[PDB]
Design an enzyme around this catalytic site. Structure first.
Site, short mmCIF file in Angstrom:
data_model
loop_
_atom_site.label_atom_id
_atom_site.label_comp_id
_atom_site.label_asym_id
_atom_site.label_seq_id
_atom_site.Cartn_x
_atom_site.Cartn_y
_atom_site.Cartn_z
N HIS A 708 0.73 -1.26 0.00
CA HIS A 708 0.00 0.00 0.00
C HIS A 708 0.77 1.32 0.00
CE1 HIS A 708 -2.93 -3.09 1.10
NE2 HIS A 708 -3.85 -2.28 0.60
N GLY A 880 -11.02 -3.36 -0.55
CA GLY A 880 -11.88 -2.25 -0.16
C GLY A 880 -12.02 -2.29 1.36
N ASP A 928 -8.53 -6.13 1.41
CA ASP A 928 -9.71 -6.72 2.04
C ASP A 928 -9.99 -8.05 1.34
OD1 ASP A 928 -11.56 -6.56 4.06
OD2 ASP A 928 -13.06 -5.50 2.84
#
Ligand SMILES: N=C(N)NCCC[C@H](NC(=O)C(=O)[C@@H](CC1CCCCC1)NC(=O)OCc1ccccc1)C(=O)N[C@@H](CCC(=O)O)C(=O)N[C@@H](CC1CCCCC1)C(=O)O
Lengths: 1023, 107, 214, 107, 107, 70
Positions: A708, A880, A928
């Protein structure tokens, strides 16, 4: 100073590479360098054909390089030509639609997802007739394709991963090879990531950091005899390429050569190549923000780090005299304004007077400011930071004074009473340390007595506090008026319109003014008393809804309302929320609309001036008294002036500072940051373009060796995005006519789920396309380019079916048809599963864990949940945050039924799966997606089938942008699983039963994963 | 008013007697009001060591399954922010042990 | 269909889930469109609804829409050339302001189906000179010719096709408390969509029920 | 738009115009656009019928009158040289056209 | 039909309103669909026209016939070497200079 | 097909000239040609300084090349 060179390719003594986004060529012999192609946009990859004559090039377009396509360069006549009109979507870490390799006949083989449902499906295609036709190789997703002794070598996800050094997740690079003259075998599957594969002789050379740093390795055509050839330590080598004799690559902005026979590496001397004008012009509106109303009908705002004081017209503009990074500007006096100046050390409060010229700048560090206000009397300012503190900074001395500190979130929602005595603000709090929800209570700080009082209780969310002119009441909003609204599709309810305004009289005994209690019948005149004021709270008789702001006036109340709407466009496209300015007459108690199409609003100090932003994106200003007389704020009259290198140094330092300040693990940050700063800062001055700077920044982000760490937004080029004409069809060049090979469609009755041709009552499949808009397409005319040129409009299309079936229709040429392809794919798998399981198994697919996932999941869940079995396919799931909502439904156990006199049984619960569930997942499901996969296993909802998932589970929530609009992300939220800690990060989730999807599986046209799922479930459905 | 006063009263009682280790929630019925009252407290009482789900006098309706669904959720993870406090996964998960109270007036 | 002369009834179709109360007759008295409740499985948790069209001539039932959601409020246009209707298929989640949750609040959208293949969606404003209609009736595979009418999603209960406009009964999102206990009626409003200008306006508000003449 | 000219109203609320030597039949919206199928230099376009339009095609030799039908597709192109046309109109009944040239003739 | 009105306003945009209700005007959009052309075919077209105008408008008709025919081929052979507008300009202007007269401009 | 070259300048064996509105350089010795400056607009004149190092350039801007600067 030199340039930043990168992504090279070799062919004998000639070496092509990228510099300043353009393509250059250098001759090892003569030592001369020259630019061979430019002004095409941003070029990141150039590949020499076999004959070393033509060159396949990848160029990115669109402000953020969101689009890409391929071009051919011919060094013989200097001819340039576009080959693809797919308008492939791309991002920083997934620069898809590129060159894959070259087949034995010397034909270009590209890798693109343009005609696929998922971006990760970068399928291989053979380019024909310069882009006239594309023949699929049906080998499955691939990044590289190499040919050795008539054998096919395949590189999966073998692109560079600078943003994530040390990656060991399921999407890591792997190499397969052909053996049975048709079968493939995995030959290179290390624990770490493998990239940029090439073959020299009978060995495959590639890069990996299995040892802690990027080096070049190689193995035989069996993935055996592993050898380490380099020992770099300065920067990771990237972009390997070769000509069959020598390997070429770039590193730290220089190009190097590797001779396999000598095993010696040398740096090519290229020297200075290009240094464009440093002082640049920009459009203030493009990077503008923090628009605010000042005294004397003046405007203040910030753009690209600069601040300005101008008249609405933008004709008389003053630039605040302060170095880079002015985060905020706020009215502080008749001619004075307060501002927040940001530096590498932090944010500081500053004052400026656009009349006299004086502009002092305090030294007291405030941390990272995110909200800033000034009292009406101009003596102090209130500031909020990322430390969750709220404080008052003396506008004279500069000394800050912390009032209160939250331990949950920032105190950015505050206001100061007109008499500068009280400060009301939303205070985030939690009852327990591990509490699932964060409550918010309004607090009121009294300058005299210096004590904090509670305006409201701590059981919900109270916000948007506001004082009235006389400073006798405190108005505010809150989501306390609970009332459920029914879900029109799924059995569910939620709180849509539960927002209501409240008021609190600062003088006990004084009633709620909106109540209209006769003055003669009350006895106020009391004195201030903020004790137990949450008990005197009172609602204002205004129907519930979704209010964001409440403005008390003399005989009316202004309320900013936001009508219930979908979140899809906001979640992906980033579309702004539409609101409207409402007026409540205290006397008549009637409500009316003062202004609509608003997306933001700000009120002046004197409550007389209103500054808003409408949906068209423009800023407007109108007097609260006569909202009929609004004017448009213009700021693009005066150009924005800046220096590339000073901005670049500024942007780097910030990116670097955010990465350290937001990393989930504070400990590691201190060491990681200080260790990589200098190394990457020395490359900044070599950056001449935005893309250059990006290359440096991303590499330094990868230093955190975590997921990320992304980079989105920003302006890389002034080129318009590539366009692509789509009608949801697959074209196959047969003879001298294009034929419709495939016509996509999912649920015919849904919207946007089928080729626009279907609306005319015919399936285009098998039909021949004669001409489009009167122009003939076929063996000579590229149908793609044509379609691309009609994108966004309806064109006449002459069709020819079996016999004399002639059609002439006005078809809508779509700009994109990905969703249609996707829905078609889902409905296809749905049919397949139904048929193969003899109608005993249902199918559902979750594209991601965001708004779309919610849509797609329920879209089928409501029809597939009641079969004997269910396949929950989560392959390619982009993540998500709603996985928990999905697990919750799948978790439900059916324990009863409802028997109606007339009708069929009704299961209890309604949202319960009837039988056995099986989950399918691959290396393209992450975040997720990873969470869901792991949870499905842990909770034992069923068996997990597929391949290890992505492996990135450290959440991100950006809250600051770069002066150029860039949005950097930092892994700030570390996901901790019970009995696994953070183990999932940099690893992924292992499926109970592993099922690869080899290249030969694609050649056969079989889905081994879905098939195993079906079969496995059929076996479980025998009991 | 009498009802909410009663709920808040039991809420205080339970907090005090359990030395701040047990939460309290009460579901007046299984209709719209039940949905209101359940979430009105669930959002603040769900993260205690223990939880009392009081359903005495519950007049019914049809959203029980929605309530069970929430109470069913098992907390299996947490979110660690650089700055701030832990965030439980799922969000709507009871932290510890749950006990249900019911009488002859729930139907 | 009960003969108004003889009195003899004639069952067209029978649902096994719920009543077929949402229907309409074309002005030329040839077609009968209606919402048909259905379920994929015997123990299915949700009841879907598909529009069916019965043809008096030929006496056969055709499928106007697929069976994956809820299609309702069917309505024919004066000329009896198109069948308009509504459906909750435009999925888009709306955020819950208190609890972590989302639901489908405004997912209702109007659709039309031309009874003559090749004929386009009138609201699309496709130049007559650029089309070749004049075809003949054909209700086969008509759910494939379906087309949406460019009207923002929401919560529509009725669609009335007119010469150059469409009337739409909309119901703003609201709480259910008063309706569930006090029995309070649902507040709607009569919207008008100009096919030409594509603009929307309010014809009447504070409505709790509406009926249109023949 | 940059090179557009000769904007003219047609039947059925349609628009015709010329730009960069090309001609088009479109709806005001510009969403449904048809390009007249004719080589370079179409000086003028004029309403000639329900779905027919007359135009002046220019070549190196001179200007010639042409007719096109955006419904059927047919588009004949006369050979009679008119000289350098500077004005062109069609009767309301669509049988003839009036043309002016640099020879000072009206025909 | 005298019913439709098409105008051009000072802002440069084209509008259309019914003569009966001039209150309902709409904006004509044409930039929805891109204009597609070939540089070399346009250049050859433009050259021929520039050359034809120079001959058809020269004050001395006699000299035109000789001057035009004598310079046409020579300068036409350079057109294909023109890749940019400016290139084409260099060729066209040189051929205009062939008339050895004043006022042969390009704007 | 070839290009249209024009407006040259010399300095020893190096020769700069205009092609496709951009500035190019050609070496009489080696025989190699390369574009030394582009995307500045329309260049019509380039002049070598005495030392043959720097180059003064004239470029035109605006749709009809109504403006120019050096
Ligand atoms: N709010 C938005 N509009 N966008 C945010 C979505 C970003 C996203 N990530 C994921 O789904 C993650 O799973 C998660 C997971 C976790 C982990 C710990 C705590 C909280 C959440 N979520 C996440 O980042 O977001 C929200 C969040 C943050 C803090 C606190 C609570 C919620 C993600 O981007 N995923 C990768 C997954 C790749 C893979 O599956 O291997 C991806 O690259 N996806 C796209 C490109 C995109 C799309 C959208 C945004 C950025 C990048 C792809 O190329 O497939």
């Amino acid at each position: 100073m030199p340039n930043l060179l990168l992504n090279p390719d070799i062919h004998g003594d000639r070496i092509i590479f990228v510099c300043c986004d353009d393509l250059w060529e250098h001759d090892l012999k003569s030592g001369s360098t020259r630019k061979i192609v430019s002004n095409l946009g941003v070029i990141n990859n150039a590949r020499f054909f076999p004959d070393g004559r033509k060159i396949a090039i990848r160029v990115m377009r669109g402000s953020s390089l969101n689009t890409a396509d391929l071009y051919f360069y011919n060094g013989e006549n200097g001819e340039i030509k576009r080959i693809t009109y797919f308008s492939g979507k791309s991002t920083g870490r997934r620069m898809f639609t590129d060159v894959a390799g070259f087949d034995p006949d010397g034909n270009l083989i590209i890798s693109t997802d343009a005609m696929q449902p998922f971006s990760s499906m970068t399928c291989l295609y053979r380019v024909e007739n310069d882009g006239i036709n594309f023949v699929p190789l049906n080998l499955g997703p691939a990044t590289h394709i190499l040919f050795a002794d008539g054998r096919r070598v395949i590189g999966r996800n073998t692109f560079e991963l600078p943003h994530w050094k040390g990656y060991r997740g399921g999407t890591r690079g792997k190499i397969w090879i052909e053996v049975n003259s048709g079968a493939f075998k995995k030959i290179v599957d290390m624990s770490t990531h493998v990239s940029s594969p090439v073959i020299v002789g009978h060995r495959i050379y590639f890069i990996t950091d299995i040892d802690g740093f990027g080096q070049i390795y190689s193995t035989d055509l069996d993935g055996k005899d592993l050898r380490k050839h380099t020992s770099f330590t300065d920067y990771y080598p990237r972009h390997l390429n070769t000509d069959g004799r020598r390997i070429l690559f770039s590193k730290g902005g220089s190009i190097y050569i590797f001779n396999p026979d000598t095993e010696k590496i040398e740096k090519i001397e290229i020297g200075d190549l290009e240094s464009p004008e440093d002082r640049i012009i920009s459009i203030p509106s493009k990077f503008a923000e923090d628009f605010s109303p000042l005294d004397g009908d003046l405007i203040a705002f910030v753009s690209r780090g600069q601040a300005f004081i101008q008249d609405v017209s933008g004709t008389y503009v003053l630039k605040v005299p302060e170095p880079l990074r002015i985060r905020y500007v706020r009215r502080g006096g008749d001619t004075k304004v307060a501002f927040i100046h940001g530096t590498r050390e932090g944010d500081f409060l500053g004052i400026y007077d656009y009349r006299t010229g004086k502009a002092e700048k305090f030294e007291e560090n405030l941390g990272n400011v995110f909200a800033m206000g000034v009292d009406r009397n101009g003596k102090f300012a209130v500031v909020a930071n990322d430390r969750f503190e709220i404080m008052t900074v003396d506008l004279e001395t500069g000394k800050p004074t912390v009032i209160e500190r939250s331990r949950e979130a920032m105190i950015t929602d505050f206001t100061i009473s007109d008499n500068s005595r009280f400060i009301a603000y939303g205070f985030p709090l939690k009852h327990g340390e591990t509490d699932g929800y964060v409550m918010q209570a309004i607090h009121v700080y009294d300058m005299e007595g210096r004590k904090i009082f509670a305006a409201t209780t701590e059981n919900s969310h109270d916000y948007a506090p506001a004082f009235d002119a006389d400073s006798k009441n405190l108005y505010y909003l809150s989501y306390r008026s609970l009332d459920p609204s029914p879900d029109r599709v799924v059995l569910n309810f939620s709180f849509e319109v539960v927002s209501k305004p409240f008021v609190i009289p600062l003088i006990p005994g004084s009633p709620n003014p909106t109540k209209l209690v006769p003055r003669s019948m009350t006895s106020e005149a009391g004195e201030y008393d903020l004790n137990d004021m949450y008990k005197r709270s009172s609602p204002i008789n205004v129907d519930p809804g979704d209010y964001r702001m409440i403005i008390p006036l003399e005989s009316s109340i202004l309320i900013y309302s936001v009508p219930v709407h979908g979140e899809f466009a906001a979640y992906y496209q980033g579309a702004p929320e539409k609101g409207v300015l409402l007026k409540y007459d205290v006397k008549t108690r009637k409500v009316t609309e003062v202004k609509n199409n608003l997306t933001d609003l700000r009120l002046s100090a004197d409550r007389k001036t209103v500054m808003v932003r409408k949906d068209d994106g423009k800023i407007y200003t109108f007097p609260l008294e006569k909202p009929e007389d609004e004017r448009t704020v213009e700021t693009d009259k005066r150009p924005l002036v800046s220096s590339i290198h000073e901005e670049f140094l500024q942007m780097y330092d910030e990116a670097w500072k955010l990465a350290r300040d937001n990393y989930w693990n504070e400990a590691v940050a201190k060491e990681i940051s200080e260790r990589i700063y200098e190394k990457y800062r020395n490359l900044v001055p070599l950056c001449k373009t935005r893309y250059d700077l990006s290359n440096v920044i991303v590499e330094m982000q990868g230093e955190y060796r975590t997921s990320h760490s992304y980079e989105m937004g920003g302006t890389f080029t002034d080129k318009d995005p590539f366009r692509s004409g789509r009608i949801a069809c697959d074209f196959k060049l047969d003879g001298d006519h294009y034929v419709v090979a495939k016509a996509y469609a999912g649920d015919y009755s849904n919207e946007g789920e089928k080729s626009p041709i279907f609306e005319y009552g015919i399936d285009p499949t098998g039909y021949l396309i004669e001409d489009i808009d009167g122009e003939t397409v076929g063996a000579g005319s590229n149908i793609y380019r044509v379609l691309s040129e009609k994108a966004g409009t309806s064109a006449r299309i002459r069709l020819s079916g079996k016999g004399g079936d002639k059609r002439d229709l006005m078809i809508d040429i779509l700009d994109d048809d990905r969703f249609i392809r996707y829905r078609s794919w889902v409905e296809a798998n749905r049919r397949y599963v139904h048929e193969r399981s003899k109608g005993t198994i249902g199918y559902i697919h979750i594209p991601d864990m965001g708004m779309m996932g919610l849509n797609e999941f329920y879209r089928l869940f409501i029809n597939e949940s009641s079969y004997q079995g269910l396949i929950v396919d989560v392959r390619f799931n982009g993540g998500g945050f709603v996985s928990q909502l999905i697990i919750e439904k799948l978790m439900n156990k059916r324990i009863g039924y409802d028997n109606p006199r007339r009708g069929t049984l009704s299961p209890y619960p309604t949202n319960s799966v009837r039988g056995k569930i099986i989950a399918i997942t691959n290396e393209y499901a992450g975040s997720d997606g990873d969470i869901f996969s792991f949870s499905f296993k842990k909770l034992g909802l069923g068996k997990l089938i597929g391949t290890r998932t992505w492996g990135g589970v450290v959440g991100i929530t950006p809250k600051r942008r770069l002066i150029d609009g860039t949005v950097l992300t930092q892994p700030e939220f570390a996901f901790w699983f019970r009995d696994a800690g953070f183990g999932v990060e940099n690893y992924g989730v292992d499926p109970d039963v592993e099922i690869e999807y080899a290249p030969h599986d694609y050649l056969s046209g079989k889905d081994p994963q879905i098939d195993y799922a079906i079969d496995a479930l059929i076996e479980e459905l025998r009991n």
